[PDB]
Chain A
Amino acid sequence: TRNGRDSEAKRLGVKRFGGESVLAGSIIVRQRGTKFHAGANVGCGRDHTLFAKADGKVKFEVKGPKNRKFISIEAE
């Protein structure tokens, strides 16, 4: 019938890009699905928010037999 509705933007996306130094608990990326997967020292929240489980620099890699993007923390 009639349009005119929308929802508030959710501010998704990457918060800390490759090489950035983060503290433990820092949110790395907010996402709906697991577009990015948790690697080493990275947790996956209930809404699939990837957060650093240790200090260090974030690192993006593509691994596995399905070429999936992983995010890990190079502990430094």
Chain B
Amino acid sequence: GFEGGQMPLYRRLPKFGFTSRKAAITAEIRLSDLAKVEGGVVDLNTLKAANIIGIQIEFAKVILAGEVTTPVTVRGLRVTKGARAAIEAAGGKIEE
């Protein structure tokens, strides 16, 4: 970063933002990961057992990424409106 004495780029620009401690305990789950789970019903514990999310994850969200083919019961997870349609299209069920 030394530029010969001129105020370097990372010092003449302002600092911004802050780091959220909740983002470190939140994960995203692809539709293609719903088949890797064991038992069909997916929750925090079953996703951790399947080594899909970290052990310290407290909040998990399923997004429209990949593709789901089997009926899956999502429980206690936030689901995007795009993934909600794809899960219900494969005979799945979403319950809060």
Query: Does a CB–CB distance below 8 Å link A and B in the complex?
Result: no
Residues of B within 8 A of A (CB): none
Residues of A within 8 A of B (CB): none
